Design a protein around this nucleic acid. Structure first.
Ligand SMILES: [Mg+2]
Ligand SMILES: [Mg+2]
Ligand SMILES: [Mg+2]
Ligand SMILES: [Mg+2]
Ligand SMILES: [Mg+2]
Ligand SMILES: [Zn+2]
Lengths: 102, 193, 56, 50
RNA sequence: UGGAUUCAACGCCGGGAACCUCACCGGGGGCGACGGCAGGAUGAAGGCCAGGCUGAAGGUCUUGCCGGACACGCCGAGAGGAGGUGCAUGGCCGCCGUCAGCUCGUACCGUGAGGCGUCCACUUAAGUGUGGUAACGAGCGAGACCCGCGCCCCCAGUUGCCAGU
RNA sequence: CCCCGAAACCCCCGGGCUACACGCGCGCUACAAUGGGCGGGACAAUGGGAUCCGACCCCGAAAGGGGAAGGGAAUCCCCUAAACCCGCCCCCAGUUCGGAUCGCGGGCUGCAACUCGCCCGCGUGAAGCUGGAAUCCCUAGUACCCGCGUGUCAUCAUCGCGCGG
C-alpha cells in the first residue's frame, strides 16, 4: 500500500482543525491508518512599515503580521478514502495538497 | 507559487475588487463581498443593501459588472449573485455612506446624525458614535462627535466587536469625513454575572 | 499632418520607474517582500483587509 | 493632405501606370523615384535602381 | 527642485537619486473629450521608403511614396498637472501623553455663570484602591483584553530529533 | 478654490539633485598592549529564496568565471559568524598604531559606470598620541562590546527594522 500526504495550510486554526477532524473521523469510519496532524512551523510574514506619511515627527512603526498555520497528514491511499477526501468541503480560507508517496 | 504568495494574491485581488465596487455601488449600501472558486467557475456574492440598485435594469448592471470582473481582474468564470445585510443598521460602513449621501443631498449634519443615531439605537445597538469632521459651519473646519449608548475604544474587544466605518461626503466646498462606530448587543470581559 | 507619434511609454525592467503601486500608482516606497507591490501608505491603510494583524 | 494624386495615364481603353514596381514585393505595390532608387509605399524597405 | 529648524528639523520625508525615480536645467518631440468654426476624403484622417537638418529621430522637408478615410487651421469647453494653497479640507502621523485624565444621571449648593461628585489622608504605574466626606452611582480612558517568552501535562511524530536495540 | 491648459499636461536625450573657502547634527574608523599582524582552534539566532537560492566539481592569486544536484521552503541553499582562545613577530613609537588620499592594473552589475557605481591586487602613507566649556543613553540578560539577517536592492549599507553572542 502506498501512502498519501495531505499538506494543508490556513490562517484559521479552527478551519484547520475542522478539516483534520473530518479526516480523522472519516478514516476511523473506515479503518485506514492515520499519521496524525503533524503541526509544521507556522510562517510569520512580518512587515514593518513606518506609520507616518509626512516624514516629520518621531518615527513610529507598524509591525503588521500574517500567520500561516500548516499541518500535514499521511493516510494510506485507497480509492475510497481518496474519493471522499476529495469530496471534503475544504473551506475557502484554506489550501490543501494531496501528494502521494509510492 | 508559494503558499503565502497565494494568500497574499487572493487578499490583494479581493481588496481591489472591494475598492472598485465601493466606488460604483455606493448608492447600494455595498457592505462587502465574498468569493469562492468552485470548479465550474468563481462565484462571488455581493452583500449590499439595495440589490435593486446593483442589478439595475433587468440584470444590466451585474452583466457589465461581471464583464469588468473577468477582464480587469484575473477570474476564471464570474458568477455574481447578491445578498442583503441581515442588520445594516448594525453595519457601520453602510451607515456612514448613507450619512454621506444625505449630507450630499443637502441635509443638515446635526439632523442627519441624530436621525441615524436614533435609527441605530432603535434597531438595537448598545452604542454608537459618529464623528463629522470638516468645513462644517463655515470655512474653518471643526469636528463634532454625536454619541449615544455605551461604546468602547481601546483594546482587542474594540478591535473585534465594534464595527467601524468611514466615508467621505464630497460637497460643493469640500470633504466631510464621516466616522461611524457601532457596538452591538454582545458582551465584554468585566461583566462577570 | 503626416508625422509619427512619440509618447514612447518605455518599458523599464528595473528601477523606481519599473515598480508602481497597483493602487495609487506611486513609484518609490513600494513593498515587494512576498509578491506585493504596494506603497507603504496604502499597505498601512488596507493590511487588515488582507489579513495582516498588529499583534506584537 | 497632398490631396490630389491621379497618376495613371489613360492610353485609351486601358490605363498605363505612372508607377514603377518592386521585384522582391508583391503586386499592386507602387513606387517613387529618388534619383537612384525606388520607394515602397506598403511597408518601405531598402532598394535601388541597379 | 522641494518639505521639515528647540523639545517634536538635520542616516527624516522609508530620500542607499547613473536612466527612470524628479518635481531643477539645456534641447527635442506628442496631447482639445464634446460641440461648433475653416474646410472636407478629390484619396487621405494616420502611418510612411533614401537622405539634409537633427544629439538622434517620417519630427521636418525639395524630390517623389499608398494601406482605404474627417476636422486646434479657430473658439469655447476640457483631459492631465509632483503647479499653488496643509491657516480651505479629509485621512494618516507626531507632540502634550500609555500622561491620568474626560465626563454623565440623579440629588444638593448657588439669582447666576458655575459648583459638588472629580476634595482630604494614605496607597497605586494608574481619578488604582481604602477610609473620611452633599454626595450616591455610572461610563470612556487605566485595568480587563490580544501577542510573545519562560515551567509542567495531554495530543501529535513528518520534511524534525537519534538515547536505547 | 486658484492657476496652467497646447503649456505649469505627457514622453525622450543629456546634465543636475553627487557641486565646496565654510558653520551644524547624527554616526564610522581611530589615536594602540584593556593592543596590531600571521598561522592555527571554537561556539549562534533571526530571517529570506523562481529567473530566485544555489550546494558539489573545475578554472583563477583575488575579486570573480563555467557547469550544476537539490530546493516554491522544518527536506535544499543562503550558513562552519565575530568578538573569544592557543603559538609566533612587534615592546610604547606618528610605530608592524592609523588607514585620509592618490597612481597602476584586474573584474561585476547595467542599455549606459566620464560626470557618478561596487569589488580585488600591488603601491602610497594624511591628520590623529584621550579631547575645554557643555552635553547624551541607560536599572538585568539591561547598558557597553561583537558580528549576522532582512528592507531598500539590476549593482550599491558607516542607514532603518530586527537577531543572537
Ligand atoms: Mg478632573
Ligand atoms: Mg490597556
Ligand atoms: Mg595597519
Ligand atoms: Mg602613543
Ligand atoms: Mg536611509
Ligand atoms: Zn498605494
Amino acid at each position: 500500500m502506498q501512502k498519501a500526504r495531505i499538506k494543508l495550510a490556513s490562517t484559521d486554526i479552527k478551519a484547520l482543525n475542522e478539516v483534520t477532524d473530518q479526516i480523522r473521523q472519516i478514516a476511523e469510519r473506515t479503518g485506514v491508518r492515520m499519521s496524525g496532524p503533524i503541526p509544521l512551523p507556522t510562517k510569520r510574514i512580518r512587515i514593518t512599515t513606518r506609520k507616518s506619511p509626512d516624514g516629520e515627527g518621531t518615527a513610529t512603526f507598524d509591525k503588521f503580521e500574517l500567520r500561516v498555520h500548516k499541518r500535514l497528514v499521511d493516510i494510506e491511499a485507497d480509492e475510497r478514502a481518496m474519493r471522499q477526501i476529495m469530496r471534503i468541503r475544504v473551506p475557502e480560507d484554506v489550501t490543501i495538497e494531496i501528494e502521494l508517496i509510492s | 507559487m508559494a503558499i503565502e504568495r497565494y494568500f497574499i494574491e487572493e487578499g490583494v485581488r479581493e481588496m481591489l475588487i472591494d475598492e472598485y465596487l465601493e466606488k460604483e455601488l455606493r448608492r447600494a449600501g455595498y457592505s462587502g463581498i465574498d468569493i469562492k472558486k468552485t470548479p465550474l467557475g468563481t462565484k462571488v456574492v455581493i452583500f449590499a443593501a439595495s440589490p435593486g440598485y446593483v442589478i439595475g435594469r433587468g440584470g444590466r448592471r451585474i452583466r457589465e459588472l461581471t464583464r469588468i470582473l473577468e477582464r480587469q481582474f484575473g477570474l476564471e468564470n464570474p458568477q455574481i449573485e447578491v445578498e442583503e445585510i441581515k442588520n445594516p443598521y448594525l453595519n457601520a460602513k453602510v451607515q456612514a455612506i448613507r450619512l454621506a449621501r444625505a449630507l450630499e443631498r443637502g441635509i443638515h449634519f446635526r439632523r442627519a446624525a441624530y436621525s441615524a443615531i436614533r435609527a441605530i439605537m432603535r434597531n438595537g445597538a448598545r452604542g454608537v458614535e459618529i464623528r463629522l469632521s470638516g468645513k462644517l459651519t463655515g470655512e474653518r473646519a471643526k469636528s463634532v462627535r454625536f454619541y449615544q449608548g455605551y461604546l468602547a475604544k481601546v483594546g482587542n474587544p474594540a478591535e473585534t466587536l465594534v464595527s467601524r466605518g468611514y466615508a467621505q461626503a464630497k460637497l460643493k466646498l469640500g470633504v466631510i469625513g464621516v466616522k461611524v462606530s457601532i457596538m452591538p448587543p454582545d458582551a465584554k470581559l468585566p461583566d462577570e454575572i | 499632418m503626416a508625422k509619427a507619434d512619440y509618447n514612447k511609454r518605455k518599458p523599464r525592467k528595473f528601477g523606481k520607474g519599473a515598480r508602481r503601486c497597483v493602487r495609487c500608482g506611486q513609484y518609490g516606497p513600494v513593498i515587494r517582500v512576498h509578491g506585493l507591490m504596494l506603497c507603504r501608505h496604502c499597505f498601512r491603510e488596507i493590511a487588515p483587509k488582507l489579513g495582516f494583524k498588529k499583534y506584537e | 493632405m497632398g490631396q490630389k494624386w491621379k497618376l495613371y495615364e489613360v492610353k485609351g481603353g486601358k490605363v498605363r501606370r505612372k508607377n514603377k514596381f518592386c521585384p522582391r514585393c508583391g503586386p499592386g505595390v507602387f513606387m517613387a523615384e529618388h534619383k537612384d532608387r525606388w520607394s515602397c509605399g506598403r511597408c518601405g524597405y531598402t532598394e535601388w535602381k541597379r
